[PDB]
């Protein structure tokens, strides 16, 4: 097998069982990891659902490769203890992570310099009787925390609300739509699903931005 | 990490070739003399060629067979190259060229070919059957690994012994070592392989529209011989005179004429040094035995 | 003391010596200083990496931990300032086990450092100092303490020891302690009396050493 | 269109190194010649398949001189020959009152490989030598061409064997064999053997009427324990050498 | 045991091919002129082959780069859709595949005027399609084409073919069926000549036949870069006849 790790004996396995409008909820925490120098935490709890993870800064870093203009962001999803979600299913939530904070980051301000964005899928309860696209727009939130705490040169505190299988991120309070994801759902639904991630927006930057101002 | 080397040296072993010299003091198709020692352990072995040195184990566990072939044991062996026989190496290079061209000739050499009888691997099926190892291990490079490594693998397998074994269903009885004897292990075949080392006087055309064959073949190149070779070509075979592979990957071209030429060549090169070894594993087990003898009247 | 070794005996690399302790066979290889590569380099003092193989199977964490303790000893040994945006590779290649690789590492440890020794002399690197290392058991049920033990008495030893020395003055000075292993059960107490043993044996381990150094090597000298 | 292609009138070549025979025969090299041997079987009268061929020297040293010879056929049966795949096919020879039913062709067995009297024939040769305690000094696995003297009924050897008036050195050779068979009849038997005695009866059929009325049996007299303690001897001390050559596909 | 028939006694193959007989051949030049200089197609039989050049161009770091001549890459795929039963895992690093990475570059390290172009890349790109048997010397007569697909300095034709050996009798291109049921070699041969680039032998063979054997693939190699040659002339002579 992997000769780089201690995977026990081959013929083990691990262990089998069989069966014998609502609030979400945040408590957000900065300046807590001394390596980085962009921190912040995530707890989230709704309704079944408990959810806690961490996003990790570094930067700016040297590029070894060659010039550029202007700054470049790297991104990870990495599981955590209980919750495995797939390989592929990681890296496309990865583009499309990048794609709205192309529209943040005053890169051109950072010349020859790299951003290194490590995202941690900690822990998560389903306790309830598209599993990742209920946790897209908490990851923003914790991004953008962090990168404030970096202290990087930052447009807007850009945001994601989520309306039942839908992500839609936001700027300028919301008057702009800056990352757009759908499943399944209805058909037509946008008008409506135009408001429950805005309102959630609309809660959301305020709590982050109680957050820091208050610290 | 290169090896570097001047052109006037270059120069030089080609035109031994051309007056029929090579610098070792052996013939063109003469090969080294092999020293064959066994460690106190069954399956070790310690085999040396002069300047190139190698060793190798045999050991053996308890494991479950494949789905694959559910009849039959597992096998398999490890030749990684430790930087310690020589500075070219990187650690552990699974990945390199050369390791794979030491590779799957031994591949094919002992696995493909089936010398040893993986079915008499079988202790239950498909529930408890046997993991044999061979771990090669490099000491230090003149050449000849591919052919060393041929041997001290086969070498291996026939100082090997297994111990006792007894079944009940899941009561799979391994008895002590001493009480109950270690029993060693059938070989269908014992192969031999041959490097042979290739070397152009000439340009490119008149090795392929020059009409005349003239190309040099030698045995066991050493190591300043081996980084000038135009061609790399090894054939293996046994006593029962079946061929059991040929590789020639490409390198210089070269007539077929020849290549028969050559292989007769190793046939009686090879039947000799192969009933060397099997004096050696009697009279070695003939020692072991006497000193059995030197042992039961002693105690 | 049925130990022995060989110097000068691979041929393409810089230092090489046999092992021979009572049932271990073990080889080291030197090589160095040679050209480091990029990610290796430092610019004042030598890097050193380090490599060992062992008898059976592949390169593991197994492996990995007694390299890296062994990484620590060497580093006082070697007069690193001497060779700046330097490397020497070092590799030991385990042979016999002579010790339950599943269950133990003890010997191995005292026997390649022993191992790496010597082969740096052959290499004739700057180094520092005479070093030795032993293997110590004390037995579970005799509760008492063997220097050098078996592996049978390994089964029944409680707690299983190395210990690496520094040697000057002649080798008779214990200049520093390099590496004590202190693993299985123990107390305070006995481990003054454990250091106190092999506060003898492994300058009576280099008593031995000193001539074997000068008797394979000064034939190699010229006069 | 497998038998080799003379029929009755084939000899084998006098010249063992003739270019031809060479051309006939590249492993000629390794074929002896022990013609120059005094060659005699103990055979049924009713036999023409005859698989025996004997000698028995006596060398100065102290011991006698075992030479035994078996057909070789081998040189022409081969794997690719469809006449070897009816050796599979019939798998044997059958052995009855009326008749014998042969697993291979008559011109072949019963002629050109059968080990009868000063025909040159292909035998595959074996050398033993042994003391007067039975103890065997050397082994010595060869082909041959031999050239024998008779071949003996189940009663003409027993008149050779205890007669005391034929004798010259054929039968000093064979009054060596049933002496130190009855240590190889011992010492089997010691080391732990049984010997029954069945006489699986032999219906005399009366010769000069069709349908059997009378009832006869099977004796075994001393030229039995002669021959056979040396033919379990061909099938051990061989198979000590192939076990040894051989140790995973040996028959 | 088989239960099928391998060679008829009336001289007959699967097929009901001889012997010395051969599938259907067929090459194609410039099938991608958007893609590279070098574009080639081959179907033999139901081995269908894409096969792609690269070259003689800037290499990527100037690491990989010599002041003497070319460097040679070569990218095997195997599809898992390559055979009859659809292949589980990836073949990208799967030491089978390396061997005969390093086999065509010292196949190629000899035709290739590699003087005459140094600092410079060249790069060979495999596409396996349809897997038929015969499977090495079918890469071989792929490749031949696509360097002269850009015509690229070099030497010879150089032809490859297996041939394969039922207990006495040699088979002349034979297929997978086949190949898992007795021992076969393939020759890589070069142009007209007798001397070889590629040989390899995987299965047992007896000495005795190999003389004969290695005598047979000649005639169907000299009939292989016989059949690329006008192929490509009729392709070449369709070029200035309408360009000009």
Wanted: proline share 4%; aromatic share 6%.
């Amino acid at each position: 097998q992997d000769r780089r790790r201690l995977l026990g004996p081959a013929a083990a396995k691990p262990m089998a069982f069989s069966n014998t409008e609502s609030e979400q909820e945040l408590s957000l925490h900065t300046g807590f990891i001394e390596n980085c120098n962009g921190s912040a935490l995530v707890e989230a709890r709704s309704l079944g659902h408990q959810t806690s993870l961490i996003s990790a800064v570094y930067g700016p870093r040297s590029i070894r490769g060659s010039f550029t203009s202007q700054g470049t962001i790297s991104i990870q999803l990495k599981n955590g203890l209980l919750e495995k979600y797939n390989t592929n299913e990681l890296k496309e939530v990865s583009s499309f992570l990048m794609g709205i904070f192309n529209s943040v980051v005053n890169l051109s301000r950072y010349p020859k310099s790299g951003i290194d964005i490590f995202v941690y899928l900690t822990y998560d309860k389903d306790l309830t009787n598209s599993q990742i696209s209920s946790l897209i727009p908490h990851c923003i939130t914790s991004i953008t925390l962090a990168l404030a705490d970096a202290g990087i040169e930052l447009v807007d505190m850009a945001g994601a609300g989520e309306a039942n299988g839908t992500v839609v991120s936001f700027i300028k309070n919301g008057e702009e739509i800056v990352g757009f994801w759908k499943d399944d759902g209805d058909d037509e639904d946008l008008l409506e699903c135009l408001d429950r991630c805005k309102e959630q927006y609309n809660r959301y930057r305020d709590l982050m931005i109680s957050c820091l101002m208050n610290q | 990490k290169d090896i570097e080397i001047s052109a006037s040296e270059s120069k030089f072993i080609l035109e031994a070739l051309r007056q029929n010299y090579r610098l070792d003091g052996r013939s063109f198709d003469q090969f080294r003399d092999v020293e064959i020692t066994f460690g106190k352990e069954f399956g070790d072995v310690s085999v040396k060629m002069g300047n190139t040195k190698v060793h190798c184990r045999i050991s053996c566990q308890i494991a479950q067979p494949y789905e694959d072939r559910p009849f039959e044991g597992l096998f398999v062996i490890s030749t990684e190259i430790s930087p310690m026989a020589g500075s070219q190496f990187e650690n552990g290079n699974i990945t390199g060229e050369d390791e794979v061209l030491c590779s799957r000739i031994i591949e094919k050499s002992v696995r493909r070919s089936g010398a040893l009888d993986v079915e008499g691997l079988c202790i239950v099926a498909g529930s408890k059957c046997w993991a044999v190892r061979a771990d090669v291990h490099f000491l230090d490079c003149d050449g000849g690994f591919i052919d060393a490594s041929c041997i001290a693998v086969m070498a291996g397998l026939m100082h090997f012994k297994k111990p006792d074994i007894t079944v009940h269903g899941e009561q799979i009885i391994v008895h002590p070592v001493n009480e109950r004897e270690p029993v060693p292990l059938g070989i269908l075949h014992i192969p031999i392989c041959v490097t042979f080392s290739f070397f152009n006087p000439q340009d490119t055309e008149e090795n392929i529209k020059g009409e005349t064959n003239s190309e040099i073949s030698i045995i066991d190149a050493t190591l300043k011989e081996e980084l000038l070779r135009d061609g790399v070509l090894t054939v293996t075979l046994n006593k029962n005179r079946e061929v059991v592979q040929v590789s020639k990957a490409g390198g210089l071209p070269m007539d077929a004429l020849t290549l028969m030429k050559c292989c007769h060549e190793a046939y009686s090169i090879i039947e000799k040094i192969t009933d060397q070894i099997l004096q050696l594993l009697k009279e070695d087990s003939e020692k072991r035995n006497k000193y059995a003898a030197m042992l039961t009247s002693e105690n | 003391m049925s130990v022995q070794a060989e110097i000068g005996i691979l041929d393409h690399v810089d230092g090489s010596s046999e092992f021979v302790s009572q049932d271990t066979k073990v080889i080291c290889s030197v090589t160095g200083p040679i050209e480091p590569k990029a990610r290796q380099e430092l610019p004042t003092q030598l890097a050193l990496e380090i490599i060992v193989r062992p008898a059976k199977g592949v390169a593991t964490t197994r492996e990995k931990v007694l390299e890296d303790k062994l990484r620590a000893v060497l580093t006082p040994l070697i007069t690193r300032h001497c060779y700046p945006r330097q490397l020497c590779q070092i590799t030991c290649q385990i042979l016999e086990s002579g010790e339950d690789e599943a269950e133990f590492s003890l010997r191995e440890l005292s026997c390649c450092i022993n191992a790496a020794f010597l082969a740096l002399v052959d290499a004739g690197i700057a180094l520092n100092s005479m070093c030795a290392s032993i293997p110590i058991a004390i037995i579970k049920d005799t509760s008492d303490i063997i220097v050098d033990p078996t592996a049978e008495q390994l089964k029944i030893s409680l707690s299983v020891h190395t210990l690496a020395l520094e040697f000057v003055n002649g080798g008779k000075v214990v200049k520093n302690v390099l590496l004590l292993d202190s693993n299985g059960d123990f107390n305070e107490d006995q481990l003054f009396s454990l250091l106190e043993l092999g506060e003898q044996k492994c300058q009576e381990l280099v008593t031995n050493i000193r001539r074997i150094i000068q008797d394979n090597i000064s034939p190699r000298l010229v006069v | 269109e497998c038998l080799p292609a003379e029929g009755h009138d084939w000899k084998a070549p006098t010249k063992l190194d003739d270019p031809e025979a060479v051309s006939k025969d590249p492993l000629l090299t390794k074929r002896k010649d022990l013609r120059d041997k005094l060659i005699c079987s103990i055979d049924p009268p009713g036999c023409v398949d005859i698989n025996d061929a004997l000698h028995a020297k006596k060398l100065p040293n102290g011991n006698w001189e075992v030479g035994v010879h078996i057909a070789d056929v081998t040189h022409f049966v081969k794997p690719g020959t469809a006449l070897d795949a009816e050796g599979a096919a019939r798998g044997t020879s059958v052995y009855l009152v009326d008749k014998r039913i042969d697993m291979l062709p008559m011109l072949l067995g019963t002629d050109l490989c059968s080990l009868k009297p000063y025909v040159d024939r292909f035998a595959f040769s074996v050398i033993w030598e042994l003391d007067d305690s039975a103890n065997i000094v050397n082994v010595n696995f060869m082909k041959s061409v031999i050239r024998s003297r008779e071949a003996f009924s189940y009663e003409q050897a027993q008149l050779r064997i205890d007669d005391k008036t034929q004798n010259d050195e054929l039968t000093m050779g064979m009054r060596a064999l049933l002496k130190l068979s009855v240590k190889l009849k011992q010492k089997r038997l010691e080391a732990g053997a049984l010997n029954l005695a069945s006489p699986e009866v032999k219906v005399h059929m009366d010769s000069e009427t069709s349908d059997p009325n009378e009832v006869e049996i099977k004796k075994l007299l001393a030229t039995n324990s002669l021959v056979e303690e040396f033919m379990l001897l061909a099938n051990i001390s061989v198979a000590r050498k192939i076990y040894d050559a051989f140790p995973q596909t040996a028959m | 045991m088989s239960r099928l028939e391998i060679y008829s006694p009336e001289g007959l193959r699967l097929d009901g091919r001889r012997w010395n007989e051969l599938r259907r051949f067929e090459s194609s030049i410039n099938t991608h002129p958007h893609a590279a200089d070098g574009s080639s197609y081959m179907e033999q039989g139901n081995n269908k082959i894409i096969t792609l050049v690269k070259g003689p161009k800037e290499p990527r770091l100037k690491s990989q780069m010599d002041t003497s001549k070319a460097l040679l890459n070569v990218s095997v795929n195997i599809t898992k859709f390559s055979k009859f039963e659809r292949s589980k895992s990836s073949h990208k690093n799967e030491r089978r595949v390396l061997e005969i990475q390093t086999s065509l570059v010292r196949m190629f390290e000899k035709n290739v005027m590699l003087n005459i172009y140094p600092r410079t890349v060249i790069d060979i790109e495999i596409h396996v399609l349809e897997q038929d048997g015969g499977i090495m010397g079918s890469l071989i007569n792929g490749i031949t084409l696509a360097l002269i697909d850009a015509g690229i300095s070099m030497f010879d034709y150089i032809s490859g073919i297996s041939v394969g050996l039922y207990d006495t009798t040699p088979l002349l291109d034979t297929n997978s069926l086949e190949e898992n049921a007795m021992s076969t070699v393939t020759l890589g041969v070069v142009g007209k000549s007798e001397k070889l680039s590629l040989l390899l032998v995987e299965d047992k063979i007896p000495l005795d036949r190999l003389e004969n054997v290695l005598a047979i693939g000649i005639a169907g190699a000299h009939r292989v870069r016989d059949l690329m040659d006008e192929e490509l002339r009729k392709h070449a002579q369709k070029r200035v006849s309408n360009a000009s």
